[PDB]
Amino acid sequence: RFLKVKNWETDVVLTDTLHLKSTLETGCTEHICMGSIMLPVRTKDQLFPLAKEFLDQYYSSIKRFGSKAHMDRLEEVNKEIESTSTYQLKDTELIYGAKHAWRNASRCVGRIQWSKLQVFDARDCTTAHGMFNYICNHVKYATNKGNLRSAITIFPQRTDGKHDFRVWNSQLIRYAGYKQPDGSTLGDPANVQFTEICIQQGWKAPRGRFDVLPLLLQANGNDPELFQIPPELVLEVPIRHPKFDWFKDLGLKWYGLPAVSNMLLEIGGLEFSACPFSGWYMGTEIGVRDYCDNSRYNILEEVAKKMDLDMRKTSSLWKDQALVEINIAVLYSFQSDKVTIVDHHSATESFIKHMENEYRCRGGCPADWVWIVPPMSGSITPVFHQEMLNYRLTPSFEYQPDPWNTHVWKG
Template sequence: MIQYQQEDGSILGDPSNVELTQDIIELGWVPPEPRSRWDLLPIVAMAENDAPAWADVPAELRDLVDIRHPRFENFQKLGLKWYQFPALSRLGFDIGGVQYTAAPFIGWYMDAEIGVRNLADSFRYNTLPDVAKALGFDIENYKKNPEYAEIEAMEDLPDYEQLVWMSRAQAELNYAVRWSFLQKGVSCIGTLAASSDWTRFDDEHASKYGYRLNSDPYWIAPPQGSIVPVWHRGGAPNYQPKPLIARHRLDPVKSWRRRRSVVKTPVTRLVKVGEDWVTEHITPVQNSLCIENGTKNLTNGVPTIPKKKVHIYYSSTGTSALKLTEKLRRRVKELPGGFQVDFNILNLLDLRKIKPSDPLLMVVSTTGDGRFPANGAEFEAAMKDRVMEYNGALAVKYSIFGVGDSAYPTFNAASVKLHEFMKAVGGIPIANGLTKGNTAVEALPMKAFNRWWSFVKDSLTGEGANEVATESTEDECFEHHRMLAGFNTGRLLSKSPSETGEGRIVMITMDLGDMDYIEMSHLRLLPYNTSEQVTRTLAALGVSSASQCVPFRDTTMPSLSYGEFFQHYVDLEGRFKDLAWLPEAFPAGDRWDTNGTVLEVLERLPGLQQITDDLRMKVCLDMPLLRPRSFSVASSAKYVGKGLVEIMVRLHKGGRFSDKFLSAIAPGDSIKYTPVTIVPGQDLISSQKHLIAICTGTGFAPVRSLLQQKIRVLMEAESQGMDFVFQSPPISIFVGFKAHDEALFEETLAVAERYGLIDMLFRVPSNKQKRRVQHYVEDNKESVLAKIRDGSIYVCGAKAMVNDMAAKLSDMIGGDVRQSLGRRYVEEIF
């Protein structure tokens, strides 16, 4: 089977054939369009001192077997297939000291080769998690148990829970393979039958000759144990009895590359014309191409931006830290814009090779005696020397997640030591610097890990769950100070409509000054506390002057007044983290009502007006920090005016930004903002291919900005009496909204329709029939499929809608839409 490696590193097809697919593309073979997980590579042969010749597998031999299950209907939705006959690539027959590199191989499959290995192995098609879901595995049922409330996937469960589902999935997949081959009338031997044949033959040989046959157990043992990692390890010595089918002594691809400069014959393609085979000379591709859905390394003539690099290192005693680190790696690689990930054990971390612009993320567990595990012990041993060597001058951005057990007095000692070391060498903490996970509370500390990840994601991209309230530390304040340095100050011009209510969308217009932005981009907006709230907080804590400096212990922290701290750093509308300072403030044990916002609690505690600076500092650091929120721009500066931006905000009762902050400010007031550098839909702006936009609610904002940009171009041409025709076709739009928000959508849609910018528009207001945009997309399946043959899809909305839309589109195209379309499928979740 073929394998396409896409630009983001994801795989479409069989991961074991990464190099083989690329090698054959370099011989001039062109993959079919559209591409799928089940495309077949051509047959390539090469004689000594000759150039390769290749031919596509004839159509009559290309028929695949659809893998279905007679008892589970959901199996068919997985879209699994396999080809009918075994094919060996780059393998020869070794006998009598001679390797025959093109010996014929005749046989048929054993069910386990396909169902247990090819489709199931985690490094092949890795279908067992999806098969388990088809059999009834539902992560939501596990999450009802408080112990598993934070898990996200089967891999987060304890190993005994995973094994029962993986074993069942493996058995049923193997059954489905055998059943499907029988239904197709294709030969396929069963595992038990093949094993019985071998053991009977071996017994007969032993009875006749007095000894059993030499054999390689990995060739004759049923591979059902392959879901357990150690099965793949083999053992020493690696016994390979002859004769056997073995890898070529000389790799044919490497041989060709070494000799192609002296081989005079051209690469040949064989094409079947009628009953005859005709040869064509092919010019090989000299350099590797980017085989990502037909996309070159240029977008409209503009070179792609190199990926940012993130370093991830771990030190683990068991599986918890390793699982979390692998989860971290996947999450970073899945972030929009793409990140290059450097992944390894802590012993191999060389801080001198980390650039200041590249974040360093570390997951570290602690041994029972408070030390680093073995794969981090060498790094620990070198810490003292490294502190002297770097002398506080190593400005590396870092964050640590510690995995420890609070039952031990050395709880998270290794991660704390690493945190102190990084600060000593000059490291700059990001994402809280250090977050401690506790395996005494959760076997896999997902709750703490997810909280840490929300800040890591925010630091890397400026997006994610930005309103998580966590304990403030001086490190966090320092990080917040650095974050504020990247914010600009804009001005609110208007809010509409004037009638507000739960769930309504408000359009705010801001003046950004000289800052420019592109369509479909995002801005991070940071709320702040009002002057009246700051004055009340100063009084509640007995601070005589707003200009009085906050007494941070960290001398590297810039001088900061209490007025600035209470207005732009801490969230007075949030809640205290743990109120651990209360017993110190009120040793008599007085009971106070601590249910409410920071400001409400402070004003209930009059005794705080006479506290020491040290205690006041503890109170301040127990306040949650203000967190920015990311919003898509809903306008084009070319349309609304230079420096102006419109943003769609859905009102949520009690929401820190959408409700409390927006209701507290008026036109003319300032708003802090910063642009988000990563724009997932950037390639769509200048694309000359068809675009289908599917959006709901405020997810319409990016589409609105794109339409405004196109409208402006046509308006300028119209004003000059010119005709202008876009090279890209009109946009197809499916948009859902609540009836009371319709005016915000209709204004731009109506103008775009008048200018012919939309060829297919489905307005889907909320309705009693519960008809959603997804249903209208399904109703127009033929049109949608025709447009995305070489076009793109943009989906933006709530998580449930985006995932449901991906599932429905996958059903429509007969494969995973995200993998099949690659960068031509863009989705954003708000």
């Protein structure tokens, strides 16, 4: 039951007891490990145990476990589910829940910051125009002129499943992708489907390479509506290299604010289907993945050519050399414009310190090694040498289907 994890660099061993609190499942079995697979309404009876589980942890956290206040609240919530088939979180509960969903996020390397999350309560929102206003305020607060601050905005919880709030966008800020007559993709290929959805809904696409997508927002189960984020709220950084003057001529830029907007927040059985959240970038996210994935901007060959590397044979490591340079450029560009960014060395070192804190004060830290180890220079970061246990605690952030696959278009 009590599991040990070893760091093979430092020989430090930690003991995990926290995994014994996971109710949810991993996709693995005793015979098969699915650790590398990307993706392996509640009835009344379903809901009270989940609410109770949550309220017990909440009341424990504030040192009032078993108190009258604790028991009073369970009964109140119990009576509310019984009567209304659902319930409403107190503001203190919502804030605790969202922070803990971040705390429990096994794939997030930035969790040392978890207790500092700014939670914006948008549960009073009723319309798409209201959603747009809440989202601009989030973008402006979080961006903070380049001195980024973590934040989440929480729209109304699911009820009957036919009045869901959703941000159709996968992040608040992303670039369009356009399939071309000549077979190629212009822009970001990751966003081709969603861009088409915007167009057929009305968007007049500019048809460039770095077109900030419009917001497509769904309130109360209604058909979604298009809105443009004030251009002046979208902070971008042009990418240059401190040594190569030709780099700026590649014409590359990226946006400062990473804001995942397609996930579902579960707190105490309640489901928050629209819950955009933001932090700040780790450099490799943009320089390794967004820029060098073959299926993304796929820029390695172009960069390698401008560096005049020998690209006749893989064993010259021309791909590897170009990769480091692209990532050097990304960090230098964000730092020079005073936009918060963390490099993979600093971020992984912080995470190892966070793990140790969590093991000491909480009995463990769920971590997905496949996601925590950066996509370049893996073994020269400390996380590579750290064994991790992956398990699922709630409150949690969950994947959910894209809404265009399930939306019944009212028309």
